[PDB]
Design an enzyme around this catalytic site. Structure first.
Site, mmCIF file in Angstrom:
data_model
loop_
_atom_site.group_PDB
_atom_site.id
_atom_site.type_symbol
_atom_site.label_atom_id
_atom_site.label_comp_id
_atom_site.label_asym_id
_atom_site.label_seq_id
_atom_site.Cartn_x
_atom_site.Cartn_y
_atom_site.Cartn_z
ATOM 1 N N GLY A 31 0.822 -1.252 0.121
ATOM 2 C CA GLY A 31 0.059 -0.088 -0.035
ATOM 3 C C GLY A 31 0.796 1.339 -0.121
ATOM 4 N NE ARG A 102 -2.905 -1.301 19.503
ATOM 5 C CZ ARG A 102 -2.849 -1.928 20.485
ATOM 6 N NH1 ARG A 102 -3.641 -2.279 21.323
ATOM 7 N NH2 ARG A 102 -1.643 -2.926 20.443
ATOM 8 C CD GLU A 299 19.660 -16.269 -35.098
ATOM 9 O OE1 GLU A 299 19.200 -16.382 -34.235
ATOM 10 O OE2 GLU A 299 20.126 -17.000 -35.829
ATOM 11 C CD1 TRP A 321 23.825 -17.049 -37.102
ATOM 12 C CD2 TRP A 321 23.861 -18.835 -38.214
ATOM 13 N NE1 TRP A 321 22.460 -17.596 -37.375
ATOM 14 C CE2 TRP A 321 22.395 -18.423 -38.065
ATOM 15 C CE3 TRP A 321 24.352 -19.797 -39.143
ATOM 16 C CZ2 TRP A 321 21.461 -19.289 -38.498
ATOM 17 C CZ3 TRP A 321 23.278 -20.775 -39.779
ATOM 18 C CH2 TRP A 321 22.013 -20.381 -39.421
ATOM 19 C CE1 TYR A 347 15.971 -20.669 -40.247
ATOM 20 C CE2 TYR A 347 18.185 -20.169 -39.514
ATOM 21 C CZ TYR A 347 17.203 -20.876 -39.696
ATOM 22 O OH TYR A 347 16.950 -22.115 -38.517
ATOM 23 C CB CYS A 407 17.113 -25.403 -36.249
ATOM 24 S SG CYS A 407 18.592 -26.511 -36.197
ATOM 25 N NE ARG A 427 16.873 -28.859 -39.574
ATOM 26 C CZ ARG A 427 18.029 -29.263 -39.020
ATOM 27 N NH1 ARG A 427 18.098 -30.560 -38.579
ATOM 28 N NH2 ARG A 427 19.169 -28.582 -39.002
ATOM 29 C CG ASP A 430 20.102 -27.511 -27.260
ATOM 30 O OD1 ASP A 430 19.729 -28.164 -26.141
ATOM 31 O OD2 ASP A 430 21.084 -26.903 -27.460
#
Ligand SMILES: NC(=O)C1=CN([C@@H]2O[C@H](COP(=O)(O)OP(=O)(O)OC[C@H]3O[C@@H](n4cnc5c(N)ncnc54)[C@H](OP(=O)(O)O)[C@@H]3O)[C@@H](O)[C@H]2O)C=CC1
Ligand SMILES: NC(=O)C1=CN([C@@H]2O[C@H](COP(=O)(O)OP(=O)(O)OC[C@H]3O[C@@H](n4cnc5c(N)ncnc54)[C@H](OP(=O)(O)O)[C@@H]3O)[C@@H](O)[C@H]2O)C=CC1
Ligand SMILES: CC1(C)N=C(N)N=C(N)N1OCC(=O)Nc1ccc(Cl)cc1
Ligand SMILES: CC1(C)N=C(N)N=C(N)N1OCC(=O)Nc1ccc(Cl)cc1
Lengths: 522, 528
Positions: A31, A102, A299, A321, A347, A407, A427, A430
């Site tokens: 709070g 109280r 990448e 790479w 790619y 991959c 495909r 890891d």
């Protein structure tokens, strides 16, 4: 003992408070200036209602017989707790309201809103009442005392994954005392990630037999022990999306096929899994270990540019790479006439120029081969119900020219109600080193395509083909399975960026990444 | 009444009997032959039989003790009751039935004529009294045809545990035709193979720390106003079933998820579909051939198409000469013209599956050209990788040649196959970008399952799992009525595929090398 007989549960929501190590204590903001730290978090406010009001009468009798031998819920506040509530709802939509004070006497409110003198004077009030369970709504001081006097059984803890200014803190829950038994799905409410966890205090059935019969055929499969997945196996509900990854680790450790690979290291392998992550609710960056995203973002920017030049990365100290571009590696690939760090038609080449004749990594390929990246964007924008929106990196003709075959075989995109989902088929996976990076890569990609097409990201779906865990990763992954995920962070893209080719490293921010410490997978 | 108090169940195993065929549940009715069972060993049935007839739950007895003692106004073992012929069929080594209280019905025989720990009774009546005076968990009627007939007629059986043995044998005694008003199927097992036959297990039923269960209700505070509200009363049968473990429910349950939660989209034509994105189905080809049973499918056409692929053919005329029309509509003047293939001969489908499987990267000319040693022979390559580098993670076959998409009659629906090899067993993932759940997918499951068999065999391995990944999974809106009929049909045990085993080469298969045995199927459906 009192706290099992009477059913005393706390229920809290803690945010973060103003390099950095994380633990459960990270979340403690309660709070500020007498109100909650945050403006409004309606999912946690909704969770609050459901949990406090919920009743099951068919299991109350079993409570009624144990409680005596010694319908609605009890909700305990403190003055500054009771006070801070906006007026127009008190008492709280049909609950037995109760205040530990109280300097408040029971006269000057209702006869339903039972005040209490001290903590010890609550056990009095319960043995004389008809209620389901007892929820400490709290306050700093209220929680402190109820916990100090082992009164609390379970703790319904909402982890608010955002930082706020706080004047009051939940106490450091003792982890030899209490321990997390359940973690929920991760959610976005009001521009923050959150999740719901549960600390417990430590120590027709015609169709139930039919179940056993149907199991009449079931089979130390792999040398992986019981006592080692203790925390993992000691959770009841594991609904956090990170369990989708962790459970694949478990399945492959428990049931995986023992195999040689080319290296010789040894793997446990299974074949065919799905993972779905909701990109509208979180950024799925694994929390059970530190992960870094600069390299994998570079990448991606490298792919989008059409680059196959391994060196553009090496000069930016992104070494993803490096191994795949050495003289020694290209020679083992029979690529004797390929320059070091010329990764061949991989790619980026395939995304921008599929079908073009690859020469070397410095040629001009402008307007040669099929610019698939451009093509799926137009399709997304101009033909969103198309079932032909694939980005395919697996070009059979060029496989032997690539440093290695992709991959990540392909992305397929789907569009409904201004929302974009993506499937990546991988495909070879890891699970220990690769997959965590791979999830992050294509989630970011899914956002980037989403933004430049004026769509909201929905689901990233990860299809694993050959799913392997390296034998020399099993210790590390054993340490990792017995960690409990934190609520996920979020990805903020620079919104100015409106073409896929205009993202720089600056345009990417990860927020509220709360994580366990790093693991050498080796 | 009397069946619920004493928990009197029947357990049987029925095969098909000697007889353009129609199939109901009365298809599976054959019980025995010449005093014994119609079949030699079906071990998996025998083991099921033992698990069910010997399983007790200690903790559950107390409440059954109470219930039964209440009605009579007042180690643990099951009771098993059998006709005298039934009892005489059992070999000495297994008499009396182990770990069970054996009872025998007979008039010709009395206690004196048995050495063994057994109760003899001459009346059904006498059994109910016997059960009254005994401690047992459950009472199972092991049959004989005559014992089955009278315990049914006397409305005495709570549930029939029923093995469908999906083969045909000479039979002299039969199970009674079960009245479908009396008994409804509520469960159907996985399908399995044992002693060269498929079988499943179905249960007919008769008609007319609880702290962490609350934690579940909480972790659901944010659930559903469920998209397309199609009516419950329509899927009555489908939703009544308690256990839907037949692999065909993998297909059926996707139809349901798309119907109940599918996104409404108008598509390529201006028609109408419901779509979702990303499913996986797994089918254990070592255990069954997953040809769907909730409607009729013929495989001749799709086997011709697969042999046509493997030859590298792109010529639609070859399939039409075999009266296979699967590609006819994608081959017309109208269609090739609308795909801008103005300079393409009718039924010249361009560089599609076959061409990409044997010649990926070769320039397509026309469907008559000799493309020998042009392009990458993917099929030969993956047959070599499976043989010589079985752990390779690159055994993909891919039809999605990005360069040639616009020259095909249409891009491939079935994008790629990845293969996996462990312990002399071959599995196959197939990624499908676009799946018509209604007409396409039943066939697509059949095609790639047959393909896994073919590759497995010519590589000297055993088929394991065929895994089917669906991208854009859709149901045409005019298929909806037809699919409702279908979801309310209960699957039968899957058939089996026999490959002529003399075929050692992927190119050497021909139509007659393919035999589907024991296809038990519901009625033909027009999705239209
Ligand atoms: N994060 C969360 O989940 C929640 C946060 N909050 C926040 O909590 C903050 C207030 O909490 P914190 O300052 O402790 O305030 P509290 O709600 O704990 O209130 C403290 C008061 O409760 C009474 N009290 C406490 N202990 C005793 C005792 N042992 N015997 C008799 N009376 C006792 C006293 O009232 P008196 O004044 O009469 O002395 C005391 O001053 C606010 O900012 C509120 O928004 C509230 C609920 C939940
Ligand atoms: N496929 C399967 O699941 C099963 C197959 N079978 C097969 O079926 C055949 C045996 O069955 P089927 O010939 O009907 O014969 P049964 O096993 O039903 O034998 C009937 C005999 O049991 C006695 N009996 C039955 N009812 C009564 C009664 N109400 N009161 C007194 N005696 C009674 C009589 O014995 P008596 O002659 O002494 O008077 C009667 O002739 C075999 O081939 C066996 O292997 C058996 C069980 C299961
Ligand atoms: C602490 C509690 C019970 N649990 C969660 N998860 N979130 C909170 N906000 N809760 O505060 C106790 C309380 O009195 N809350 C409250 C605050 C404002 C209104 Cl309007 C109603 C109740
Ligand atoms: C009828 C029954 C009990 N159910 C199934 N599913 N399969 C059968 N064979 N059963 O046979 C009844 C019976 O008398 N069985 C029997 C038990 C042991 C031996 Cl060794 C031979 C037959």
């Amino acid at each position: 003992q009192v706290c099992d007989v009477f059913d005393i549960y706390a229920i809290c929501a803690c945010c973060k408070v103003e390099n950095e190590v994380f633990n459960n204590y990270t979340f403690r903001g309660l709070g500020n200036k007498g109100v909650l730290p945050w403006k409004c978090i309606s999912l946690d406010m909704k969770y609050f209602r459901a949990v406090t009001t919920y009743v099951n009468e068919s299991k109350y009798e079993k409570l009624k017989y144990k409680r005596c031998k010694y319908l609605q819920n009890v909700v305990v506040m403190g003055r500054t707790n009771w006070e801070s509530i906006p007026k127009k709802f008190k008492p709280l939509s049909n609950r037995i309201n109760v205040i530990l004070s109280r300097t408040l006497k029971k006269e000057d409110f209702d006869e339903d809103v039972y005040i209490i003198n001290k903590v010890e004077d609550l056990i009095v009030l319960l043995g004389k009442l008809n209620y389901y369970k007892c929820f400490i709504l709290g306050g700093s001081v209220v929680y402190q005392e109820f916990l100090e006097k082992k009164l609390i059984k379970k703790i319904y803890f909402t982890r608010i994954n955002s930082t706020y200014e706080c004047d009051v803190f939940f106490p450091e829950i003792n982890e030899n005392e209490y321990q997390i038994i359940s973690v929920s799905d991760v959610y976005t409410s009001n521009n923050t990630t959150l999740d719901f966890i549960i600390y417990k205090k430590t120590n027709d059935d015609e169709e139930e037999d039919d179940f056993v019969y149907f199991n009449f055929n079931k089979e130390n499969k792999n040398s992986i022990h019981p006592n080692d997945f203790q925390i993992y196996n000691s959770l009841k509900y594991k609904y956090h999306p990170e369990y989708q990854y962790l459970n694949i680790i478990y399945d492959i450790m428990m049931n995986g096929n023992k195999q040689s690979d080319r290296t010789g290291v040894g793997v446990l392998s299974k074949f065919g899994y799905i993972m779905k992550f909701d990109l509208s609710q979180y950024f799925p960056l694994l929390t059970t270990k530190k992960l870094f995203l600069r390299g994998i973002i570079e990448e991606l920017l490298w792919f989008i540019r059409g680059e196959t030049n391994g060196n553009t990365l090496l000069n930016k100290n992104v070494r993803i790479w490096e191994a795949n571009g050495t003289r020694e590696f290209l020679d083992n690939r029979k690529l004797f006439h390929r320059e070091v760090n010329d990764l061949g038609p991989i790619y980026g080449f395939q995304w921008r120029h599929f079908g073009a004749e690859y020469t070397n990594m410095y040629d001009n390929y402008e307007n040669k081969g099929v610019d698939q990246l451009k093509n799926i964007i137009n399709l997304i924008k101009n033909d969103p119900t198309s079932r032909r929106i694939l980005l395919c990196a697996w070009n059979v003709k060029d496989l032997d020219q690539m440093a290695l075959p992709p991959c990540h075989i392909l992305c397929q995109f789907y569009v409904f109600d201004g929302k974009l989902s993506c499937i990546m088929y991988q495909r070879s996976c890891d699970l220990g080193l690769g997959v965590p990076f791979n999830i992050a890569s294509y989630s970011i990609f899914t956002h980037m395509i989403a933004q430049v097409c004026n769509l909201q990201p929905a689901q990233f779906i990860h299809v694993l083909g050959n799913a392997h865990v390296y034998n020399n990763h099993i210790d590390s992954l054993k340490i990792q399975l017995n960690r409990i995920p934190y609520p996920f962070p979020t990805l903020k893209l620079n919104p100015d960026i409106k073409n896929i080719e205009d993202f720089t490293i600056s345009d990417f921010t990860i927020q509220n990444y709360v994580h366990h410490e790093k693991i050498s997978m080796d």
